[PDB]
PDB file of C-alpha atoms in Angstrom:
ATOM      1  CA  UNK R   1     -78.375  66.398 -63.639  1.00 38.51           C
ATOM      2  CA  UNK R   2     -81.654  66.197 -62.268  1.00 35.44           C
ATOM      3  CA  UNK R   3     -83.118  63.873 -59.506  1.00 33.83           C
ATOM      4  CA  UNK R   4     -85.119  61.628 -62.880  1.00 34.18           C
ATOM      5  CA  UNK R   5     -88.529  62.509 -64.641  1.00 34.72           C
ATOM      6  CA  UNK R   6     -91.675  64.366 -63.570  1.00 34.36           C
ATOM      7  CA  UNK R   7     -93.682  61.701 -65.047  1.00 33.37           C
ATOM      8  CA  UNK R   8     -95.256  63.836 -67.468  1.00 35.17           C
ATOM      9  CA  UNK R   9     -96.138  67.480 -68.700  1.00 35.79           C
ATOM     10  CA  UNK R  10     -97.260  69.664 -71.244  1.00 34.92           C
ATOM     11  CA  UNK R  11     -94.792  72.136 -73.643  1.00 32.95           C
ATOM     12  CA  UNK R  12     -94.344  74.639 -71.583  1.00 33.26           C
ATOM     13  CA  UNK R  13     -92.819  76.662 -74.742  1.00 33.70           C
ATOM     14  CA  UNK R  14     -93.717  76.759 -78.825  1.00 32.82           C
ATOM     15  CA  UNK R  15     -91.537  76.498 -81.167  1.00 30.12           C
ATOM     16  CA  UNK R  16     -90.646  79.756 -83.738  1.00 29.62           C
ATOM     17  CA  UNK R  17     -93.265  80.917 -81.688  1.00 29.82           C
ATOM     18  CA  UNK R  18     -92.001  84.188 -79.663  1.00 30.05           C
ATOM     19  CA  UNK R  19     -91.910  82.851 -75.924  1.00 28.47           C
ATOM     20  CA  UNK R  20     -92.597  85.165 -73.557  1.00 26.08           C
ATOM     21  CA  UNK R  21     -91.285  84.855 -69.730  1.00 24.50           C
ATOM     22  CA  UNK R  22     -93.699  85.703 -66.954  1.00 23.36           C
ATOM     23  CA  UNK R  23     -91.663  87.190 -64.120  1.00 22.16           C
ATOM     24  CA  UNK R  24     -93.007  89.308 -61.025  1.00 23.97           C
ATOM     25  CA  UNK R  25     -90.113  89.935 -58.868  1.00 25.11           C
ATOM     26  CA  UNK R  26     -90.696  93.359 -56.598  1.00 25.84           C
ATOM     27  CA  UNK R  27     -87.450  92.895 -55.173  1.00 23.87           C
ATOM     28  CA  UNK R  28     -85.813  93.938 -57.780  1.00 26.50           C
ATOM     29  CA  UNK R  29     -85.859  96.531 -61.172  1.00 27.51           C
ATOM     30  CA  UNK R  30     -86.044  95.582 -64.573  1.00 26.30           C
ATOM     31  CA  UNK R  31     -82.859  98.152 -65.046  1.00 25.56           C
ATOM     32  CA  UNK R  32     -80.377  96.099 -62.839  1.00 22.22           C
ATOM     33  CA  UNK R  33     -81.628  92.512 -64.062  1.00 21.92           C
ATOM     34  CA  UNK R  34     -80.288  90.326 -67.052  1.00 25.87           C
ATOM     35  CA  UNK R  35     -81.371  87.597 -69.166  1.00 26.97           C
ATOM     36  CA  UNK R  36     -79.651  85.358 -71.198  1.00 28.55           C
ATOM     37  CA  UNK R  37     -80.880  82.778 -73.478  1.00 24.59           C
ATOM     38  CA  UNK R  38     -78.712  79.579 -73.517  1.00 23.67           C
ATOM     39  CA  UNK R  39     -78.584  76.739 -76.167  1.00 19.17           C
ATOM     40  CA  UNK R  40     -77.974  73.184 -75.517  1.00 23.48           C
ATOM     41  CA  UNK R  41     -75.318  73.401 -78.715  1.00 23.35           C
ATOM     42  CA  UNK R  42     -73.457  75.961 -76.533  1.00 24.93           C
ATOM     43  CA  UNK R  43     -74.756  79.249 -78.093  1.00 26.03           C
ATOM     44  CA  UNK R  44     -76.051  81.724 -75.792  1.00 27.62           C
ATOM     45  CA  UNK R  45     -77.834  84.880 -76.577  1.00 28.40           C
ATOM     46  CA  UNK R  46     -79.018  88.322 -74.531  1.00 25.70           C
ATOM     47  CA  UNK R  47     -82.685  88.592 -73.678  1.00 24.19           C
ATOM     48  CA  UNK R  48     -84.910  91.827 -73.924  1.00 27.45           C
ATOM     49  CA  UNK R  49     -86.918  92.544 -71.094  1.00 22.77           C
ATOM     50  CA  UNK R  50     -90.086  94.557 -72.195  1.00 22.28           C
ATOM     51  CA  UNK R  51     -92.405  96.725 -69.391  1.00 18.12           C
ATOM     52  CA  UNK R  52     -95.283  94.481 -68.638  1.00 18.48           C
ATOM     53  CA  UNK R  53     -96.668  96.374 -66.034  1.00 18.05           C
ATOM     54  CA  UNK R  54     -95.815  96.124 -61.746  1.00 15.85           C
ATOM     55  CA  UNK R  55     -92.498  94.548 -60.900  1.00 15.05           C
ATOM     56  CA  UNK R  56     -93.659  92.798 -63.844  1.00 16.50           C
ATOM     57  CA  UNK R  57     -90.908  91.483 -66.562  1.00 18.15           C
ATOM     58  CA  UNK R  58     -91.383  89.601 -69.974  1.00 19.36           C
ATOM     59  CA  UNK R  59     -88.508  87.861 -71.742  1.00 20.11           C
ATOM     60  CA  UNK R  60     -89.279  87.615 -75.467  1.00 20.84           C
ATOM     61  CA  UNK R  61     -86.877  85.379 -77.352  1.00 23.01           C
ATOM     62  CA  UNK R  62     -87.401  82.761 -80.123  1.00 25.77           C
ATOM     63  CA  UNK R  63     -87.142  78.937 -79.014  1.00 25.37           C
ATOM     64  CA  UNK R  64     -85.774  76.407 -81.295  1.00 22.01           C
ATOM     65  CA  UNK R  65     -87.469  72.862 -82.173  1.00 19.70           C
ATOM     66  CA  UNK R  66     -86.637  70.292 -79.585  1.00 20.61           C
ATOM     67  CA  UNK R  67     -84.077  71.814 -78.167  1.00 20.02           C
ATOM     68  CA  UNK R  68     -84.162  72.376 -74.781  1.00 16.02           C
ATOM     69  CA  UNK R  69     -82.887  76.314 -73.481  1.00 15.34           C
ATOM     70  CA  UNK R  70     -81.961  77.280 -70.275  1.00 15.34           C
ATOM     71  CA  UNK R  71     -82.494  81.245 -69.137  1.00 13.73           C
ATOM     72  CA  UNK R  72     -79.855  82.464 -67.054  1.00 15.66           C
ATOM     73  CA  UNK R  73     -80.702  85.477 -64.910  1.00 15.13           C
ATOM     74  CA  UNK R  74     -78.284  86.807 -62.564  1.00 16.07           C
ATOM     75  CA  UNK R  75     -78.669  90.009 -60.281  1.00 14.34           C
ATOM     76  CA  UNK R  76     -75.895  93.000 -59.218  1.00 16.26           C
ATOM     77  CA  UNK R  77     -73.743  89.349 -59.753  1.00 17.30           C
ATOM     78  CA  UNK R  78     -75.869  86.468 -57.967  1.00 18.09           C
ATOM     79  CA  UNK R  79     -78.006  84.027 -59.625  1.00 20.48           C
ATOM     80  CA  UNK R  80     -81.694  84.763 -58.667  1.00 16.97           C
ATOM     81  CA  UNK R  81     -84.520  82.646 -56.942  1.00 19.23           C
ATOM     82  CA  UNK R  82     -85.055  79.489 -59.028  1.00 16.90           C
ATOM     83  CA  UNK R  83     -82.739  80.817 -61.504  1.00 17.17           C
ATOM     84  CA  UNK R  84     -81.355  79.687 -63.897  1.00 16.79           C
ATOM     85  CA  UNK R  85     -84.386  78.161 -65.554  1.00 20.17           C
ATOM     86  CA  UNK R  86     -84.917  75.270 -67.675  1.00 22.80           C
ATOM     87  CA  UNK R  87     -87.402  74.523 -70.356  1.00 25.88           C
ATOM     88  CA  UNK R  88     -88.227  72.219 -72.908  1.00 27.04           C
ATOM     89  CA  UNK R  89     -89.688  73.503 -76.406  1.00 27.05           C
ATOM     90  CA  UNK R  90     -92.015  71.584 -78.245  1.00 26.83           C
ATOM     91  CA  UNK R  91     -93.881  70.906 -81.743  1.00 27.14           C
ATOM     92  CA  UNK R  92     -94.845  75.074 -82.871  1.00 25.79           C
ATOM     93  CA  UNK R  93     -98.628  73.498 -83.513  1.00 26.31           C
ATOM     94  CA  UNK R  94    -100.815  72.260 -86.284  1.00 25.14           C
ATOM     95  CA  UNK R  95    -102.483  75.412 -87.500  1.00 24.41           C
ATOM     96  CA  UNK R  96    -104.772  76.166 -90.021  1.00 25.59           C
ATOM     97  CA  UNK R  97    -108.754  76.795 -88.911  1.00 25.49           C
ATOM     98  CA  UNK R  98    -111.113  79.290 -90.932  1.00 24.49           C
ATOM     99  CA  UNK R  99    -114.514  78.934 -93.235  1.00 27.77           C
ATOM    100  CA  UNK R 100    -115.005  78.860 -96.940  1.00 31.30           C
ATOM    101  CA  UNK R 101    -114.971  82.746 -97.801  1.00 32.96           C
ATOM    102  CA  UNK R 102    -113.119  83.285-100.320  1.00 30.54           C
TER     103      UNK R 102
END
């Protein structure tokens, strides 16, 4: 469990919305890493990790409403820096802007 509350902060994550997973670590290659998306009901899923650019890896999976995932990422068998991370998703948005074309 954690040490309490961080006061407060901001969704960090949408909801439906695909959430993307900014990761630069040189140390390592995108062909020897892993990512796993975990649910707080106890379903866990794999992770795709798509070519951003340098060292640079994005984990695209789909969030669910106020449930909070955790993203395990473990390396040639050892949990990496920081790893396994936690976040909380929040409300997808209220959208809807645009003139009176049509």
């Amino acid at each position: 469990g954690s040490s309490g509350s961080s006061g407060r902060a901001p969704s960090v994550a949408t909801v439906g919305s695909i959430c993307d997973l900014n990761l630069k670590i040189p140390e390592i290659n995108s062909s020897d890493m892993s990512a796993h998306v975990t649910s707080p009901s106890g379903r866990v899923t794999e992770a795709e990790i798509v070519p951003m650019g340098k060292n640079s890896h994005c984990v695209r999976f789909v969030p669910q409403e106020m449930g909070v995932h955790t993203v395990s990422v473990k390396y040639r068998g050892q949990h990496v820096t920081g790893s396994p991370f936690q976040f909380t998703v929040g409300p997808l948005g209220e959208g809807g802007s645009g003139p009176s074309s049509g």
